[PDB]
Structure 1
Amino acid sequence: TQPQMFFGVLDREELEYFKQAESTLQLDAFEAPEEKFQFVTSIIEEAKGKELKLVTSQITSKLMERVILECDETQLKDIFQSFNGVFFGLSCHKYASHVLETLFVRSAALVERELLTSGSVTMENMFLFMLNELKPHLKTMMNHQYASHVLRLLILILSSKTLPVYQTPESFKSELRDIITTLYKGFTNGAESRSDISQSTITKFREYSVDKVASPVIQLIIQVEGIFDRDRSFWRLVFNTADEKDPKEESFLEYLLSDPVGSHFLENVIGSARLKYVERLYRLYMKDRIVKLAKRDTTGAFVVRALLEHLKEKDVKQILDAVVPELSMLLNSNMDFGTAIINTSNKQGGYLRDDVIAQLIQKYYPEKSDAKNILESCLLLSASTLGNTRDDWPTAEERRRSVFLEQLIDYDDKFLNITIDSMLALPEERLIQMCYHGVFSHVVEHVLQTTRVDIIKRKMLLNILSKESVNLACNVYGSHIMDKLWEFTAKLTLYKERIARALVLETEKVKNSIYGRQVWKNWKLELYVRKMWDWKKLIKEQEFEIFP
């Protein structure tokens, strides 16, 4: 019982033609867009009849995706129609399922357009035809390594959510209900009420909740079923409602809290289920062991984080009372968790702020150390991507450390001051390298908070940054730093004049760069050149605008 996924092969002539056509289309060396459209139409004309062969070959599936993205709307409807009949088979194909994903996103966009203009309802009907094609295969798709992706995308589209957001006719809401009900029928044998559900079916569905392929689909369904099913049938198929613990449910919960797929399943459903059901799970199976779970950084930590992010204030504060003392340990092996804990503390009116500040100070910027620097204890700057000769991009550990340092800077002024001092202690060429970095740039950008930085630090920072005005403005990352400097130079009009003159000196290079044009706009240098006095008046207005 396997659907047909082979539809013939192309001979070497066609393969060579389509390789050359993909190269030509990828270079995008066409002058007028009409030439590009005519070339796309030529590729489509040569691709007539061969659609099934093209989308099922690893050599030409990418070209088909490009063509689906670049063609017009009539050609899009043609390509959509040519797949008719074999949608399930294509969605079970390793390379064709991706083509189906591209096609379905573009076609959802087109259905949104035709819904908010002249109700053509042609694309809508093609979508309904493919959905009815797939409806007798939904349970199978849910467990398939490639078709489950297509099913998840279809559920996203139908429930109007962010695709990797478009409006949907009411037919799409009905089709969503159809898909969800069909799957529920397929997992409840023939039970006509929830009292008829057997314990064996519940056991097998929990098995699916832990399956690496089905679990994302179960999460999405649990999330979106509240749109039409007030009773949350799929939720009730996983967890109980009794006010007391259940041995089967307790073993299932203790398995979720120790398995990666299960922990992420629980993390995801926690944020999309009813608050009362989540509170029940917390009270029955988690309230007593919060610390032990919070230390499980690959499993239960995600659940504790979701609890901190989605519970009521009393329970959030109890969890913070449990967790904050362990923050120094947690940050050694799970910095995203610590950043979340600090963020939650801050959003809860700075709850337990003093203990957090003490732990962070003693761990990252102690007073007794001689050469204290928070860029070296947090970002590990000396052993980082910064200033390397080879073309290595910034890593993920650097990105999470930068997020953490920025969380500290937004948590208390002590960390903003510490970061500014640490920056001024580097050799200024290293700070300028930070300004040019992909991830560390944000860190620099984050200390440019005008009302929170005393005037002397602003003067030192501004003198360091002004010498590289033109080079920063024309840079992808430094241009945002210059934009922040526009406001950062408040009571320091002489640095405004210095940066303005510096940019005007190389006006030509500044305007040739795109970011240079953006900085030219944001600093309003046209008013500086044309009428200096209106520029000074704008500056004098901004001064008392920032400092009243």
Structure 2
Amino acid sequence: PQMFFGVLDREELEYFKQAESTLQLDAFEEKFQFVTSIIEEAKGKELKLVTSQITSKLMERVILECDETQLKDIFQSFNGVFFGLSCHKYASHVLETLFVRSAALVERELLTPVTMENMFLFMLNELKPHLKTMMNHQYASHVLRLLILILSSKTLPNNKVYQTPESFKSELRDIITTLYKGFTNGAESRSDISQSTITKFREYSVDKVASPVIQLIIQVEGIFDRDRSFWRLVFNTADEKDPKEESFLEYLLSDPVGSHFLENVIGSARLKYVERLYRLYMKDRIVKLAKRDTTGAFVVRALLEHLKEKDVKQILDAVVPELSMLLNSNMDFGTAIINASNKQGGYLRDDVIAQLIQKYYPEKSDAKNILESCLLLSASTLGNTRDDWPTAEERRRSVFLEQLIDYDDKFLNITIDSMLALPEERLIQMCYHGVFSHVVEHVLQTTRVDIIKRKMLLNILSKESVNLACNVYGSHIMDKLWEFTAKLTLYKERIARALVLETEKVKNSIYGRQVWKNWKLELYVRKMWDWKKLIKEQEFEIF
């Protein structure tokens, strides 16, 4: 109804363009004087400013950089056009900024005993008629989504969470229920609603702009309204197949927005409803859903997380036998199932193990490393010439592998043998690598590994004892070798000898001096007898 408030002069435009530059410069706490000089010049033009693209961001800065009593002064200058501003491409981000600062101010008033809270309530009240429109407006829907987060003390896009006053609870309710009316054009029962409006609503859940709002509400509505009638808007209560709901489900599953709406929603549904959906519609599509990764396999994860013993068992029964084909593109389906299998007391565990070994170590091959199955090793950052750090994905991969190791002895052995299968220098390379080294050291589970493998591993690493202990990463591999070497102490001797051979290189190596302590090399050097004691100590400390 109102978003075009005139334009700026050339003189005015120049002044502010000027102003904005010197602010992002920081050539100064006289900052303030400048800032509040801008404010004085902004006096009475706030609207033109906030709507113009050139100056839109200037305002946003001033909002971020001003007195609380200037904050309010600006907030005030927006009375009676808050709705227009939110519908504006630029003004609506100014609003987003302004409302977030206000939130903190309102927490402050809340903790630090005309108030910001009341200034706020006032604005909330002029939006109220316009909610329903705000919901599917490309810009205003965000301002709306924001507000709801604010009123519910949910962390704020813009670790940023503030405590709310009581009236905020009231106001959250007034806007949840105002929407409900706008969209059910009249109370008072699921009975009274046409499936003309029900489906009108179902169609929303798949809009890119309105679906996030509907999710938010559905999650947050529980605080007051135990109905939960927004959910019931979207879904039926019990306990039979409706071809309307059913085809709506498939409509959800056959869409990115729709699938993610679904899974987020599964998260805040009460368990009654989730089981219902599963029992009714999911149960016999569960594979087709899983292999429709993605999206649609995201949902099957949500089910697993948020369901109970009988159901998850049912699911695993369906999923484990196709796990090797399900790891195709995405590993994080695998961790889902393992976590699932475990949380249920190792249900279907062996076939799970069996399925992994199928995907990553199939005994029908020359090449067999999980090191190449699981980390794309040859294709990785392992020694690039180009000074490249490990990727986030590489870390992501490593971690996966690491828990595989934890999951079963089978996997620990398989990776050891994969490391052993490698050219030795390439295993050495691993030791100096940011994430991959952690994989090496993670393999050094002295109790879980048998001696022949231990001996063989030791043999590669001993060749580089000192270079290892003076490297940021290698030192951890060397540290663990102290225990890793119990009952194999012609190798302890070997290394200790090697390290003492290079005493001055090793101490006054940041990382070296540390290994020195842990191998107790100070003893070695002075009371060699007392050393050979410790070793015998640590043997029966382990066994």
* TM norm. shorter chain > 0.5: yes
* C-alpha separation in 1, matches of 2:389 and 2:169: 43
1: CA distance, partners of 2:517 / 2:74: 44
Contact 2:96 / 2:143 at 8 angstroms: preserved in 1?
yes
Cα distance in 2, alignment partners of residues 465 and 51 from structure 1:
69
* Shift of residue 302, structure 1, vs aligned partner: 1.7
Task: Normalising by structure 1, report the TM-score.
Answer: 0.77
Q: Which residue of 2 aligns with 1:125?
A: 118
**1:290 Cα offset (Å):** 1.6
Which shows bigger deviation, 408-417 or 311-320? 408-417
Q: How many equivalent residue pairs? A: 539
Deviates more, 1:479-488 or 1:303-312: 479-488
Deviation at 1:218, TM superposition (A): 0.9
- Determine the C-alpha separation between the residues in 2 that align with 1:106 and 1:167: 13
Indicate the SS of the match to 1:452.
Answer: coil
Distance 2:506 2:495 in 1: 13
3-state SS of 1:479 partner? helix
Distance change (3 Å), C-alpha of 1:530 and 1:113: farther
The answer to whether 1:524 aligns with 2:520 is: yes
The alignment partner of 1:534 has SS state of helix
Q: Which runs of 5+ in 1 are unaligned?
A: none
* Alpha-carbon offset, residue 102 of structure 1: 2.7
Q: Which moved more, 1:438-447 or 1:297-306?
A: 438-447
| Displacement after TM superposition at 1:99 (Å) | 2.8
CA contact 2:238–2:276 (8 Å) conserved in 1:
no
> How far does the alpha carbon of each residue in 1:278-324 deviate from its partner, in whole angstroms, 9 at most, with x for none?
11111111112221222211233122111111000111111011001
Contact 1:342 1:407 in 2 (8 A): no
Give how far 1:58 is off: 3.9
Q: Which structure is larger by alpha-carbon Rg, 1 or 2?
A: 2
Residues 298 and 368 of structure 1: CA distance in aligned 2, closer, same or farther (over 3 Å): closer
Identity of aligned residues (%): 100
Q: Is the 2:205–2:258 contact (alpha carbons within 8 Å) kept by the matching residues of 1?
A: yes
Q: Deviations over 1:381-438 (max 9, x none)?
A: 2223555566878767656544533442443344345446656776788778778878
Cα 1:402–1:98 change in 2 (3 A) is: farther
Distance across 2 between alignment mates of 1:540 and 1:393 = 41
- Contact 1:335–1:400 (CA under 8 A) maintained in structure 2: no
Compared with structure 1, are the counterparts of its residues 297 and 37 closer, same or farther at alpha carbon in structure 2 (3 Å cutoff)? same
Q: Does 1:272 align with 2:268?
A: yes
Alignment CA distance shift 1:493-1:204 (3 Å):
farther
Q: Structure 2 CA distance, aligned partners of 1:501 and 1:199?
A: 82
Higher mean displacement: 332-341 or 144-153: 332-341
Q: CA deviation at 1:327?
A: 0.8
Deviates more, 1:227-236 or 1:458-467: 458-467
What CA deviation, in whole Å up to 9, does each residue of 1:233-265 have, x standing for no partner?
111111112321112122212222222222212
User: Are the equivalent residues in 2 in contact too, given 1:346–1:411 (CA < 8 A)?
Assistant: no
Distance 1:539 1:344, change over 3 A: farther
Q: Are the structure 2 counterparts of residues 443 and 183 from structure 1 closer, same or farther at C-alpha, using a change threshold of 3 Å?
A: farther
Match of 1:106 among 101, 109, 128: 101
Deviation at 1:372, TM superposition (A): 3.2
Asked whether the 8 Å contact 2:128–2:178 carries over to 1, the reply is: yes
CA separation of 1:352 and 1:272: change in aligned 2, threshold 3 A: same
- Does structure 1 retain, via aligned residues, the 8 Å contact 2:327–2:359? no
Alignment CA distance shift 1:253-1:434 (3 Å): same
Change in 2 beyond 3 A, CA 1:258/1:375? same
Structure 2 vs 1, CA of residues 265 and 440 (structure 1 numbering), >3 Å: closer, same or farther? Answer: farther
- In the alignment, structure 2 segments of 5+ residues that lack a partner are none
Using the alignment, how far apart are the partners of 1:29 and 1:484 within structure 2?
A: 52
Paired with 2:526 and 2:388, the residues of 1 have a C-alpha distance of 43
Cα pair distance change 1:519/1:212, threshold 3 Å:
farther
Three-state SS of the structure 2 residue aligned to 1:288 is coil
Shift of 1:67: 3.7
CA distance in 1 between counterparts of 2:525 and 2:45 reads 61
Change (3 A) 1:243 1:6: same
Please list the CA deviations of residues 144-168 of structure 1 after superposition, one character each: whole Å capped at 9, or x if unmatched.
1221122112111212212222211
CA distance in 2, matches of 1:501, 1:42: 73
